[PDB]
C-alpha cells in the first residue's frame, strides 16, 4: 500500500510514513524488476 498506493502525495508535501514494530520484508522489493533507479547506500539489497 506504500508503493502501489492509489495516489502519491505532492513532492513539496510528500507522503510520510513511519515503520517500526514490524517484520519488514525487503525481499518483495528486491525481487521486483520494475524498479529502474534502485540507488541506495550503507546496505546491499540482498543483505537488507
Amino acid at each position, epitope marked *: 500500500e506504500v508503493f502501489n498506493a492509489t495516489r502519491f502525495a505532492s513532492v513539496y508535501a510528500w507522503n510520510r510514513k513511519r515503520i517500526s514494530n514490524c517484520v519488514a520484508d525487503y525481499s518483495v522489493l528486491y525481487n521486483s524488476a520494475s524498479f*529502474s533507479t534502485f540507488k541506495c*547506500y550503507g546496505v546491499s539489497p540482498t543483505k537488507l
Partner: antibody
Amino acid sequence: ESLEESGGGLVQPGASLTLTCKASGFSFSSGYYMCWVRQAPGKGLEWIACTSGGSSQYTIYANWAKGRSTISKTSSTTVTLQMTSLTAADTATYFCARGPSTYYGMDLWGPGTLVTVSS
Amino acid sequence: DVVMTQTPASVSEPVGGTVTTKCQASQNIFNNLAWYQQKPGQPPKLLISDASNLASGVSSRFTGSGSGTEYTLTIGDLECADGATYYCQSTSYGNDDGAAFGGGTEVVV
C-alpha cells in the same frame, strides 16, 4: 575539470606506499565520491576502493584489498590511499576517478601514475 | 562484492559492422552499469551510464540494453578509430557491492 596524481614510482617489495589525488576546479562534496582503480600492464582494470565526499566518512573497500588498503579523506581537494605489503603482482597503473551522486558512470578520469614493485 | 564476467574476451568485426559484448552479474544490480572505451596509452573514457543513458559527446552508435543480471553493449557502424578495449562496471559505490570491473574485451577492425 581536472584530476592529478602524485606519489607513485618505484617502491621496494614488502614496503608501503602512499598515493595522493589532487582535484582542480571543484571540491570533494558529498555529491561526488573518490575512487581508486588499477590496471595491470597487459591486463584489464581492477577496482580498489571508494570514499564518499563531504562530511560523510563512509568508505567501501574491495574484497581482495580489504586488509591491505586504507582510504580516507584528508581535505576537500587532496586525499591519500595507502597500501601495505607490496608485491610484484601489485605493479599497476592507478587511476583517480570521480563518481556523481546519481550512481552514474565514472567521468573525468585521471591521467594515471605507474608504480613498480621491484628491487 | 559482486563479480562481473564479460564475454567474449576477443572480438573482430569488419568496418561498418556491429559488435556485441555481454556482461553478467553474480547478483542483481538493478541497472547501475557503466560502459567504457579505453585506447592504449589513454585513460578509460565513459560511453554509457545507467546501462541505457548516453553521456554528452557520445555518438548514437553506442547502445546499451539489458536489465537484472544480463547486460548488452552494441556498437554499430564500426570505424577505424573504434579499435580499443571495452569494459563494464557496476556503479554501486557505497552499497557494499563494490565496483569490480570485468574482463576487458578488445575489438579488431
